[PDB]
Swiss-Prot record:
GO terms for cellular component: extracellular region. Hydrolyzes phosphodiester bonds in RNA, poly- and oligoribonucleotides resulting in 3'-nucleoside monophosphates via 2',3'-cyclophosphate intermediates. Coiled coil: none annotated. It is found in: Secreted. This is Ribonuclease. The chain holds residues 50 to 157 of 157 of the full protein. It comes from Bacillus amyloliquefaciens (Bacillus velezensis). The lineage of its organism: Bacteria, Bacillati, Bacillota, Bacilli, Bacillales.
Length: 108
């Protein structure tokens, strides 16, 4: 239902949580999600992967003590996951990537 960059971005800054169509990878695995099969839409119709913590290993997103980053899939409808993610901090900084976490730019 809400899975666009702008849509999810505004939902997060206002309501401080993901829309209802998101499930973490753990949740999805528990419903029978097998990444190598690209089946998420069969076991969880209308859902997207989102809410997992993003480690920011490469220190690309701005870091701060106490700030945790999470991710969510954008523009997903079916099949294997795409390369689009929204990155959101606990202080509601919003970044996007369209290249599998290689490049980030600010959107809120």
């Amino acid at each position: 239902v809400i899975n666009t960059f702008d849509g999810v971005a505004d939902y997060l800054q206002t309501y401080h949580k993901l829309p209802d169509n998101y499930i973490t990878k753990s949740e999805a695995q528990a419903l029978g999600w097998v990444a190598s099969k690209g089946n998420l839409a069969d076991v969880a119709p209308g859902k997207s992967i989102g809410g997992d913590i993003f480690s920011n290993r490469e220190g690309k997103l701005p870091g701060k003590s106490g700030r945790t980053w999470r991710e969510a899939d954008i523009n997903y409808t079916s099949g294997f996951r795409n390369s689009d993610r929204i990155l959101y901090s606990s202080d509601w900084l919003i970044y996007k990537t369209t290249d599998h976490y290689q490049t980030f730019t600010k959107i809120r």
